[PDB]
């Protein structure tokens, strides 16, 4: 049985509105309804992994697991294994996988983050799951962010608290948050960003939706606009939205948007919005292709419609040579030339680099770089030719070219990371000086850049 080099992953997000689901929810798992939908010819083909995020979920874990497993059995005739389930209040994540993957999956982690302080702590936040699939790390975040059209800044704060404090993936990657820990990171949920148009335009917006004319509405979508201004979800991708707003519907139909202010809404308008979203971030030059992104039309127990997204995701095998794991392979090396970091920091301290990768027996600390002033005020940290030679555990190019090097730039004075980034070893050539580049972030905010040249030696 050959190990896969691709899997397909189903991501679902549904705010259930504290109501039980209807008897049939198979359209969700089949990616049928509005938007970018799955071909009918694929209906019996199981995805490898199903990741289900709910919000306002009134069910016990047992009740929901029984509905999900029975649903997938009806669609695929496969009895899925439970990889993980984690619930914070009414926010839940379930990961299900095909039985053949049971032994390919390891290092399962779960965590949650509660957002807000006093007033604002009690029902919003995130749950997450990570695991290894053979040689590939996968992270999944289901978040329910602050509601309300006039709280986009709060949502962006909730996002930064979640990506700082959610403890998933390899703890040895201590300088790195979840936005660097995984080959593929999927972040979904009721993110609660709204279409930011005047209240008086409610009926105009509904008109536009009925005509399937989403362009003038998406130009005011707060997640698209906040992302464009680098206020949230920096370096994440989202597929084009081609489905109607998934909030706020009258229950038991999809023919009516319930937008008017009510005591029950805190006298807030809920203009039709794309509250329910799926985003991802994969390491550079890994295969990831969105194959569906849409909403169901036939599940109407909630004031939200379920959203689905599916992905092809590249995966690698658990590589064993005669040498590594358990030693280095002297036929392999990674060299760095003409390297410098450019930092936005106003501080003057010395910096060094840390290199972290599962291709190394452990992380590597560089010597201190030499600080200079950039021509436009920047701090430039010059490493020149001074960075160490990295010694990978396996020199075989079929392994090494699929690997990545995480970089942290740290203060000598405090050992705190000022910036994190990632370099792919999927090079155009080996034994050849080639340009490398990564933006650097800290707490998911841009803090600088790292650039230079790499020289990769493999056994070929
Ligand atoms: C360069 N990366 C592209 C896909 C992005 S991300 C984002 C928020 N806007 C754009 C144009």
Swiss-Prot record:
Keywords: Apoptosis, Cell membrane, Cytoplasm, Cytoskeleton, Hydrolase, Immunity, Lipid metabolism, Membrane, Phosphoprotein, Repeat, SH2 domain, SH3-binding. It comes from the Eukaryota. Tyrosine phosphorylated by the members of the SRC family after exposure to a diverse array of extracellular stimuli such as cytokines, growth factors, antibodies, chemokines, integrin ligands and hypertonic and oxidative stress. Phosphorylated upon IgG receptor FCGR2B-binding. GO terms for molecular function: inositol-1,3,4,5-tetrakisphosphate 5-phosphatase activity; inositol-polyphosphate 5-phosphatase activity; phosphatidylinositol-3,4,5-trisphosphate 3-phosphatase activity; phosphatidylinositol-3,4,5-trisphosphate 5-phosphatase activity; phosphatidylinositol-4,5-bisphosphate 5-phosphatase activity; SH3 domain binding. Phosphatidylinositol (PtdIns) phosphatase that specifically hydrolyzes the 5-phosphate of phosphatidylinositol-3,4,5-trisphosphate (PtdIns(3,4,5)P3) to produce PtdIns(3,4)P2, thereby negatively regulating the PI3K (phosphoinositide 3-kinase) pathways. Able also to hydrolyzes the 5-phosphate of phosphatidylinositol-4,5-bisphosphate (PtdIns(4,5)P3) and inositol 1,3,4,5-tetrakisphosphate. Acts as a negative regulator of B-cell antigen receptor signaling. Interacts with tyrosine phosphorylated form of SHC1. Interacts with tyrosine phosphorylated form of DOK1. Interacts with tyrosine phosphorylated form of DOK3. Interacts with tyrosine phosphorylated form of SLAMF1/CD150. Interacts with PTPN11 in response to IL-3. Interacts with receptor EPOR. Interacts with receptors MS4A2/FCER1B and FCER1G. Interacts with receptors FCGR2B and FCGR3. Interacts with receptor FCGR2A, leading to regulate gene expression during the phagocytic process. Interacts with GRB2. Interacts with PLCG1. Interacts with tyrosine kinases SRC and TEC. Interacts with c-Met/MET. Belongs to the inositol 1,4,5-trisphosphate 5-phosphatase family. This is Phosphatidylinositol 3,4,5-trisphosphate 5-phosphatase 1. It comes from Homo sapiens. The gene is INPP5D.
